[PDB]
Structure formats: structure tokens, C-alpha cells
Write a protein that binds this ligand. Structure first.
Ligand SMILES: [Mg+2]
Lengths: 70, 29, 172
RNA sequence: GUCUCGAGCCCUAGACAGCCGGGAGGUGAGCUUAGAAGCAGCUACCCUCUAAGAAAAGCGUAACAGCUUACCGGCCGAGGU
């Protein structure tokens, strides 16, 4: 039921299109608290037991786009 | 004796306290 | 080298000279297993294939003799069976078992019937568009099935377009 | 084709082959695009579950789907490469 991960990032980022080269061309940005919220949403989608690992999963598409974290 | 096999036997013996051959190995311990 | 084959309880295996006869509930099969310095004997309840020579050539045949004997065991008990399907596009092919040979009529529209003789005590059972070749001797069954498929061999035209024929569908 | 001799690596903590089962999630990665979801192209190629399982090696689809490869487990059992 819950929409794809790539989209949930583009909302709180303010950017739509990614980059011609991931990590080499930083586009969007995030923060720890921002990622903590997206981790609360997906439960059946993710296989992780802890919320710690739930964040790790979300933070897999991020950096490979240009989503730097602070 | 490959290192990954010795290191695996350990991880198995660890979960017992708290490949079928590696399980039997951990049991014998 | 020496390899011992324990004969199944359903089976009986007598042997004279270079010939080996294997009898079972499904029938009997006799074969000649002749090769330099390879002795094949029946020691009570086991068949023994042995030789003093261990060279590549000898070992090759020893392995062949083993598989041959094991197949006879299977044949006289469980039996050998090949399944076939008759396919045709424009011309309805009339496959029939006339006497001791399978006959194919009107193949690809031909006026003259194509036929092949069935090997040994091999039985060919036909059920509409399906055929089932069976028997105790895998040698006879294997060939009989093959013969049937080969019977519709076509060399003059593009097989990709002219696909009519009986084909081996299931192998044991 | 076959005979002989040497060297390296693997192997009963189960090798080589074969057969069976698994080959999973975030997600059909992002860019490109009407679309492209392992596999037209460009960049990247990151982390969960776990005993394994690639941001996919090979076919396959208009794209999907579909079939196997990697990798893991089992059966087998002795040498193998
Ligand atoms: Mg021509």
C-alpha cells in the first residue's frame, strides 16, 4: 500500500529528477531525523526487525542519487 | 582446514549456548 | 579391478561362456559380454566383472559391462519404456502396427506406406496420437523407438517447415 | 588414441560431476524514456533478511513474463582439478 522509497525521499527533499551521476553529482539533501520518519512508515515492506536496520535500508538509495546527509 | 569453516563452527557453538557437518561439529562441542 | 553387482530379489541371472541371461517377472534378456581379459561370472547372488588389466581401454568396457547388466536387471523387472507423439500439419498420417512391424501410411501425402520391423519382443502400443514402446531389452526398445522416429526422415526439404513425423517424447 | 613422469591447488569439517530444493527483500535501483522493471544506453553498483542469492553472468519479451548463471543447502561418497 505504501508508495515506493524513491518517492518518499523526493517529498522532503524538494527535488524531483535525480542525477546523471550518483554521488558524483550531489542533488538533494537529508538529515538523521528526516530518515528516522521514513523508517517508521515501511514495516511489511522491510525485512528488518530493529528500526536501526530499517534506516540502513532506506539509506541505500539516498547516497546513490546525490542525497547528502547531515 | 579453511578459516571460514573454523570461524563458522564458533558462531554456531555461540548460538547453541545462548552445513549439517558444521552443526554436528558444534554439537560435539 | 573388480566390480560386484548384487542381483535384485525379483531377478534370476544364469551365465554360460561369454553370454549372460537375466530373467525376471517382466521377461528375460541374454547378452554377449566379450572383451579381452574381462571375466564376467555369477557368484551365487552377485554378478562379478573383473580383470587383471587396469588400463583406460579395459576400464572403459568394465564400466560399460556394469551399466549393461544393471539395465537388464531393470528391464526384467520394471521394464523399459519410450513415449512417442505423432505430429502432422496438412496430411493426416495413419500410424498402425501391422503384424510384427509398425506401418505409417499417407506420410506427407505419400501413396506408398513406410514401414519398419520391431526388434525382439518389443511391444509397440498405440493410443490415437500417442505411442509407447516397451520391453525388457533396452537395446531392442531403444532402437525400435529410434527406428520409428527415423522412419519419417526427410532429406530433400527444409525440416523446419516440413515437421510431420513421429517423435520420441519420453525416455526412461 | 594410449602408456610413463613431474609440479600447483582442492578434498570425509565431503572435493569434481550429476540430481533435488533455495535462488529472497527495501525496489519495477537513478539517470535516459510513452516505456525500459538483471540484461537498448549513461552513472553508480550501495544495505536488510540469511545458510546462500549480483544495482545481475547468459538466453528470452515491444516492455513485462518466462529459463537458467552466479552464490547456499541437501542427496551421493573418493579421489579430484
Ligand atoms: Mg531444393
Amino acid at each position: 500500500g505504501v508508495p515506493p522509497t524513491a518517492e518518499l525521499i523526493k517529498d522532503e527533499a524538494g527535488f524531483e529528477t535525480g542525477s546523471g551521476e550518483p554521488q558524483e553529482d550531489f542533488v538533494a539533501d537529508l538529515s538523521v531525523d528526516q530518515v528516522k520518519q521514513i523508517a517508521e512508515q515501511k514495516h511489511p515492506d522491510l525485512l528488518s526487525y530493529d528500526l536501526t536496520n530499517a534506516a540502513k535500508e532506506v539509506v541505500g538509495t539516498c547516497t546513490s542519487l546525490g542525497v547528502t546527509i547531515e | 582446514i579453511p578459516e571460514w569453516k573454523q570461524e563458522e563452527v564458533d558462531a554456531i557453538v555461540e548460538m547453541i549456548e545462548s552445513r549439517n557437518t558444521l552443526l554436528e561439529r558444534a554439537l560435539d562441542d | 579391478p573388480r566390480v560386484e553387482l548384487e542381483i535384485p530379489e525379483d531377478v534370476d541371472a544364469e551365465q554360460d561362456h561369454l553370454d549372460i541371461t537375466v530373467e525376471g517377472d517382466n521377461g528375460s534378456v541374454t547378452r554377449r559380454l566379450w572383451y579381452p581379459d574381462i571375466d564376467v561370472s555369477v557368484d551365487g547372488d552377485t554378478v562379478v566383472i573383473e580383470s587383471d588389466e587396469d588400463n583406460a581401454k579395459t576400464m572403459s568396457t568394465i564400466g560399460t559391462f556394469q551399466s549393461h547388466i544393471e539395465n537388464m536387471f531393470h528391464g526384467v523387472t520394471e521394464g523399459w519404456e519410450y513415449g512417442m507423439e505423432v505430429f502432422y500439419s496438412h496430411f493426416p498420417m495413419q500410424v498402425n502396427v501391422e503384424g510384427d512391424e509398425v506401418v505409417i501410411e499417407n506420410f506427407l501425402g505419400e501413396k506408398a506406406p513406410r514401414r519398419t520391423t520391431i526388434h525382439g519382443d518389443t511391444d509397440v502400443e498405440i493410443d490415437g496420437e500417442e505411442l509407447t514402446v516397451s520391453g525388457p531389452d533396452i537395446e531392442a526398445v531403444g532402437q525400435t523407438a529410434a527406428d520409428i522416429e527415423q522412419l519419417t526422415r526427410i532429406n530433400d526439404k527444409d525440416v523446419r517447415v516440413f515437421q510431420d513425423g513421429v517423435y520420441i517424447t519420453r525416455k526412461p
